[PDB]
Amino acid sequence: GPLDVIRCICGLYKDEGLMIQCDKCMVWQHCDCMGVNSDVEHYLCEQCDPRPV
């Protein structure tokens, strides 16, 4: 909702599919765009933890 921030590598501000929250900065990202699923124990976005995606 309004208080939740979507900031995925795709740059599309849309709530779609399985989404995952960065543990530190709290943005939401699409699991499919980031290559993860709900099985990971912890998650950081690509700005908090720079890496190829």
Binding site: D15, E16, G17, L18, M19, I20, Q21, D23, W28, C31, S38, V40, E41, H42, Y43
Partner: peptide, 12 residues
């Protein structure tokens, strides 16, 4: 980790 799926398909 915290996840969500707002419009998830249900079998029900």
């Amino acid at each position: 980790a915290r996840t969500k799926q707002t419009a998830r398909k249900s079998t029900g």
